[PDB]
Amino acid sequence: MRGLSRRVQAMKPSATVAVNAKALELRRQGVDLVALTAGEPDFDTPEHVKEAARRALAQGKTKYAPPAGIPELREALAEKFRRENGLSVTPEETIVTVGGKQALFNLFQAILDPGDEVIVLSPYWVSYPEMVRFAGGVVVEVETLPEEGFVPDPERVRRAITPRTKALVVNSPNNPTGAVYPKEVLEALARLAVEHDFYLVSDEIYEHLLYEGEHFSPGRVAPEHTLTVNGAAKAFAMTGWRIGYACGPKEVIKAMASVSSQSTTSPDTIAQWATLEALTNQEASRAFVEMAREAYRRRRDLLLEGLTALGLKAVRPSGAFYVLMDTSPIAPDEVRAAERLLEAGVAVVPGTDFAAFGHVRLSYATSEENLRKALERFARVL
Amino acid sequence: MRGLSRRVQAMKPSATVAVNAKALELRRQGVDLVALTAGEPDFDTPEHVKEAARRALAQGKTKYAPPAGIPELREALAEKFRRENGLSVTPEETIVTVGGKQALFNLFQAILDPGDEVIVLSPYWVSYPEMVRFAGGVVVEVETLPEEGFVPDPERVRRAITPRTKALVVNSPNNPTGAVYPKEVLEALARLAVEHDFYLVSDEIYEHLLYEGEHFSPGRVAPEHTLTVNGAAKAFAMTGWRIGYACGPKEVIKAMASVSSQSTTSPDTIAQWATLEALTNQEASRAFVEMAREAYRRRRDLLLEGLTALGLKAVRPSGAFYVLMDTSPIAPDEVRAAERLLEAGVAVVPGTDFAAFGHVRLSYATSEENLRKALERFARVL
């Protein structure tokens, strides 16, 4: 018989997709929309990285790479994780993937048997629950509150642990909230993993997009329980390159490379060489990160002042480039809110898919000029 | 609790791995080995494709691409499948993946429920059974015989169909036998699919590497039951670029795009723009393909002549760049023969993982000087 598998059939439809199509309708009928929907840097990838790609091409590095990545990059990864994150890892406890999303996907395929439970903290990145379910797992959600600045309360996470708990996913700096979790909270979560024996999955791709506080990595205290996920996409404006990386327990990294061998073989060889330059030339990369961080901070401040002036509520973000805005004064729910804003000329992402009901995610990875136009149209709606 | 999933632990230990470790050892102790193991072209990727990638870099095409691929590429894919394969497909029945391997992986994830049977023709590419089992599928092996030139008999295939049969994988030109299946055989196989209601998966990556006969795509006779898999890897010496493509039933393609969105998002954007050039610059691309095909033809003939002179048996290949050699005169089995050849200075691939027992796979994607060098060493294992 023909027909699709149960797993692919159990994929819920996005609310973002529904609003996106309407936005195209408007653009097509000539409506000028200011988009605050981007999930990637507006900056282009830095030249030192582009130049390394050009050299790789000229040197004919166009052949299959090992499943876990080019050895040079794995060594560079071991250094980065130790130097920047205080993580005690060897090159063999490192892996290169097709974006940080593939590292997460491979991870769940490697540790989840049907029925295994994964604790997710809402609001969450849309992809976490889908990948957990795809591998046959069970999503157990724990809520973080706006009045607590979207920082998890360890006691609330405590209530979601059962004997079937396999993993707990933590994402700081956070997408969609922009919250940076304090080290004491992160240490508390790591103690739960060690006490209850499960994996702590730390999604740290926004580590360099930090305006205040410090980025702490839970693997510093519980290396055998923690799988650290990261990548080049957000910090180096390399979303289209598809290069992610992770480190953690040897047995898990090895299993993750086995999954890559049966699915993608290895990430694009030229992108691996270009990423190696991003990691080795610290001087040029630092210059890009500081330039981007200063620009995002200015943009965040501009946006927040404006929202506040209008009376619109938003928890001040400490990292990444997103702000979750309460839509109560605009409409009774996010989707309706998103549609009215579309009609006023502003495209936003409804919070539905992230489990951030009553909110809309705004992205400031745009120009100041665009941010001021958006605040104007927002004022009209009000 | 912690631990690995049963699907990752269910993966078998490769026989290619044990000889390879022995080869690494030998190479460590200085030993010179002539490798006839390559699974990729020896040629570097053609200059026009390289230039198209530099253009995308200079234009800032470094952002996220749609899950099914850049629109420009899906369009050119529709033209390719129609022009070159006689396939009437629309761009929406087309998908771009992280190599042809991902296309196959995403497909099995999208169509196989635990228990479903997939018929695979042996000798087979190592990855087929792994991909089927990883998704819950049950492999059903149908042997092809050296006496029949490794071409399947529809009759033996018919005997293997059960009410649990969901798919039949066909790979022509074949890895590792080099066999090219005749249109009539390809039509008979397609017929069983329509007649017994299951999918026919046609791996056609070596289509442009054909020395005699003609490439027929079964999708022409059962378009609703067929998923045609291809890619730029073998044809344009782009293995490290990771760009594969497929076409077939609109509902399956859409499901495959859903698997990509939760795992890799989309293939590298720079590599997609590069591939469009290979697909659209018909003039430079054919010049490359004809050049390669001539070099492979010369090399196959030299290798076949030398083997016969040595009294060694191999079924004459009409496509790809492999030769399956009978190892009985050398040792009682493939593994022992491969180790003997290693000691004699030649590295080959044992037929064990491909279900080609008593054979060893030889690759002619290396220089004639290396082929000649290997042939001289062969005298020592008689």
From Swiss-Prot, chains A, B:
Keywords: Aminotransferase, Cytoplasm, Pyridoxal phosphate, Transferase. It is an enzyme of class 2 (transferase). It is found in: Cytoplasm. PROSITE patterns: AA_TRANSFER_CLASS_1. One of its GO terms (cellular component) is cytoplasm. It catalyses: L-aspartate + 2-oxoglutarate = oxaloacetate + L-glutamate; L-arogenate + oxaloacetate = prephenate + L-aspartate. Transmembrane segments: none annotated. It comes from the Bacteria. Its EC number is 2.6.1.1, 2.6.1.78. Its cofactor is pyridoxal 5'-phosphate. The keyword Transferase applies. L-aspartate binds at G39, W125, N175, R361. Gene3D superfamilies: Aspartate Aminotransferase, domain 1 (3.90.1150.10), Type I PLP-dependent aspartate aminotransferase-like (Major domain) (3.40.640.10). The modification N6-(pyridoxal phosphate)lysine is found at K234. The record marks K12 as: Important for prephenate aminotransferase activity. One of its GO terms (biological process) is biosynthetic process. InterPro entries: Aminotransferase_I/II_large, AspAT/PAT-like, NHTrfase_class1_PyrdxlP-BS, PyrdxlP-dep_Trfase, PyrdxlP-dep_Trfase_major, PyrdxlP-dep_Trfase_small. GO terms for molecular function: aspartate-prephenate aminotransferase activity; L-aspartate:2-oxoglutarate aminotransferase activity; pyridoxal phosphate binding. Catalyzes the reversible conversion of aspartate and 2-oxoglutarate to glutamate and oxaloacetate. Can also transaminate prephenate in the presence of aspartate. Homodimer. Belongs to the class-I pyridoxal-phosphate-dependent aminotransferase family. This is Aspartate/prephenate aminotransferase. It comes from Thermus thermophilus (strain ATCC 27634 / DSM 579 / HB8).
